[PDB]
Amino acid sequence: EKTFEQLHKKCLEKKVLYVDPEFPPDETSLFYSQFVWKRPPEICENPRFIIDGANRTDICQGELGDAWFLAAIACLTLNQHLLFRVIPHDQSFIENYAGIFHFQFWRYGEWVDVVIDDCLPTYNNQLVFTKSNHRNEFWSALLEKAYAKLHGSYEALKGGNTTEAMEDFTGGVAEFFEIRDAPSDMYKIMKKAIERGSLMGCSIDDGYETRMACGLVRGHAYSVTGLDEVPFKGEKVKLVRLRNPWGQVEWNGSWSDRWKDWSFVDKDEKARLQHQVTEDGEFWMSYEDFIYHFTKLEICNLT
């Protein structure tokens, strides 16, 4: 067991790029039961670890069913100071680059360091697994690789629970809600949770194209990224903001991006709500419609 510092320092002196003996760039690391592995400098001219900050737009699901995990990362980015425990800032392609990176996860009641080489699965020189909106940003793809290593393979990330990942990023305690049994004050419970920095997911119980007619997807982890109140036509309306970790496929009901009655909303209020018409996976919906469609709500509470 050599540490990140040690391995990094060594590779720099040797002038060699690191290769992970524990989790090598071959089919063992992909599955337990076809892609070319490439490092980000082999993929593009000017790769970067973090560009314009690490935020939820940098998490876009690829050809692997790990939404449960990605939704949790996206939630984590809403709490930057927690985020930078999981992701060390002092990492770069343009300075002290030795093809090695690391991340931290809460496991067994303590922080543990996962080290990886920066080889990533590609096809036609593009990432097949999770990537960022920005073709040159690689933190999220690398984090996913590190989480895969922690579970033994990329395939091991197929299916899982959002709360598992939330706990692995925070060391917090999971709390579940069946939205049918929801208390009267659950908007308030969720509001206090988001303001306290707690991570929130939700889903529609089951038992890449738009699944439902309303634009939601069944059996799919969504990140809760906002809760707010807007006064519209005299009265105040409770809203919920969600993000689909696909980065695509939004709700189309009231308060959706292209909803016309956004025109009746004040221009400053729009700004406070960060309302944009963009196919980014993120959308506002009414608290009412939210409680009506979603069935499970998962909150990971901190200390």
Q: What is the distance between the alpha carbons of residues 77 and 54, in angstroms, rounded to a whole number? A: 7
C-beta atoms surrounding 240 within 10 Å: 27
Nearer to Ca ion, 34 or 276 (CB): 276
User: 3-state DSSP call for residue 204?
Assistant: coil
Nearer to Cl ion, 8 or 241 (CB): 8
Helix (H) or strand (E) holding 164: helix 162-170
Tokens 């009414």: give the residue. 286
Q: What is the distance between the alpha carbons of residues 101 and 94, in angstroms, rounded to a whole number? A: 13
Helix (H) or strand (E) holding 283: strand 282-286
Residue 58 site contact among Ca ion, Cl ion, none (CB < 5 to 8 Å, cut-off depends on kind): Ca ion
Count CA atoms within 13 Å of residue 204 on its CB side. Answer: 15
Q: Please identify, among the stretches 46-54, 69-77, 259-267, 286-294, the one whose residues bind Ca ion according to the rule CB under 5 A.
A: 46-54
Within 10-39, the residues that bind Cl ion by CB under 5 A are none
Question: Can residue 58 be called a binding residue for Ca ion (CB under 5 A)?
Answer: yes
Nearer to Cl ion, 80 or 96 (CB): 96
Contact 229, 238 (CB under 8 A): yes
Question: Can residue 93 be called a binding residue for Cl ion (CB under 5 A)?
Answer: yes
Within 256-295, the residues that bind Ca ion by CB under 5 A are 257, 278, 280, 282-283
Nearer to Ca ion, 255 or 283 (CB): 283
C-beta atoms surrounding 77 within 10 Å: 21
Task: Give the distance from CA 211 to its chain's centroid.
Answer: 21
Parallel, antiparallel, or unpaired for β 120-123 and 36-38? antiparallel
Question: Can residue 229 be called a binding residue for Ca ion (CB under 5 A)?
Answer: no
Question: Can residue 52 be called a binding residue for Ca ion (CB under 5 A)?
Answer: yes
- The number of residues in the chain equals 303
Site string for Ca ion, 140-159 (x = CB under 5 A): --------------------
Question: Of 3, 92, 125, 278, which one interacts with Cl ion (CB under 5 A)?
Answer: 92
Site string for Cl ion, 36-55 (x = CB under 5 A): ------------xx------
Nearer to Cl ion, 41 or 215 (CB): 41
Nearer to Cl ion, 39 or 241 (CB): 39
Residue 92 site contact among Cl ion, Ca ion, none (CB < 5 to 8 Å, cut-off depends on kind): Cl ion
Contact 68, 221 (CB under 8 A): yes
Nearer to Cl ion, 136 or 286 (CB): 136
Contact 117, 17 (CB under 8 A): yes
Instruction: Determine the size of the site formed for Ca ion (CB under 5 A).
Output: 8
Which tokens belong to 235? 């009265």
Q: What is the distance between the alpha carbons of residues 113 and 63, in angstroms, rounded to a whole number? A: 26
Residue 178 site contact among Ca ion, Cl ion, none (CB < 5 to 8 Å, cut-off depends on kind): none
Q: What is the distance between the alpha carbons of residues 162 and 170, in angstroms, rounded to a whole number? A: 12
Nearer to Cl ion, 92 or 274 (CB): 92
Q: Please identify, among the stretches 36-44, 89-97, 169-177, 264-272, the one whose residues bind Cl ion according to the rule CB under 5 A.
A: 89-97
Within 169-208, the residues that bind Ca ion by CB under 5 A are none
Which residues contact Cl ion by CB under 5 A?
48-49, 92-94
Which residues contact Ca ion by CB under 5 A?
51-52, 58, 257, 278, 280, 282-283
